[PDB]
From Swiss-Prot:
Ca(2+) binds at E92, N109, D110. This is Low affinity immunoglobulin epsilon Fc receptor soluble form. Residues 5-124 form the C-type lectin domain. The chain holds residues 158 to 292 of 321 of the full protein. It comes from Homo sapiens. The gene is FCER2. Disulfide bonds join C3-C128, C6-C17, C34-C122, C99-C113.
Length: 132
């Protein structure tokens, strides 16, 4: 009936859980690190979710789960969803910079995928209160 339960070290927002990771990672590195924790690099689909992420975002930049896929020819989230909501920094995005990071402001920019960032965000679904 109510789905806000999250694992230790994760934080709940709405029906999801979020992990604010710290450590030096390239984009595909953060992707696999989230997968190792049974999550995914975060996907962002509303201003309310973004505002939550901004409150907890690292000041020096974080990888998020968005990258430009060559065959589809567009930015696609790690879970296969399309970009409906976006929070690009003004002028962004602008060949080579295929991966997407989130600044301390919450705003996004594209970047070389081998850039090393000190933070990254995973998400997963929250679990739910049981039957009595």
């Amino acid at each position: 009936f109510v789905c806000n339960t999250c694992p230790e070290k994760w934080i709940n927002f709405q029906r999801k859980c979020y992990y604010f990771g710290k450590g030096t990672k390239q984009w595909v590195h953060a992707r696999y690190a989230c997968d190792d924790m049974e999550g995914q690099l975060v996907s962002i689909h509303s201003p309310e979710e973004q505002d939550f992420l901004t409150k907890h975002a690292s000041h020096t930049g974080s990888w998020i789960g968005l990258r430009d896929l060559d065959l589809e020819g567009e930015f696609i989230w790690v879970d296969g969803s399309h970009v409906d909501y976006s929070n690009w920094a003004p002028g962004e995005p602008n060949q080579g910079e295929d991966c997407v990071m989130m600044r301390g402001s919450g705003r996004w920019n594209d970047a070389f995928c081998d850039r090393k960032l000190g933070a990254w965000v995973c998400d997963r679904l929250a679990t739910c209160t049981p039957p009595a």
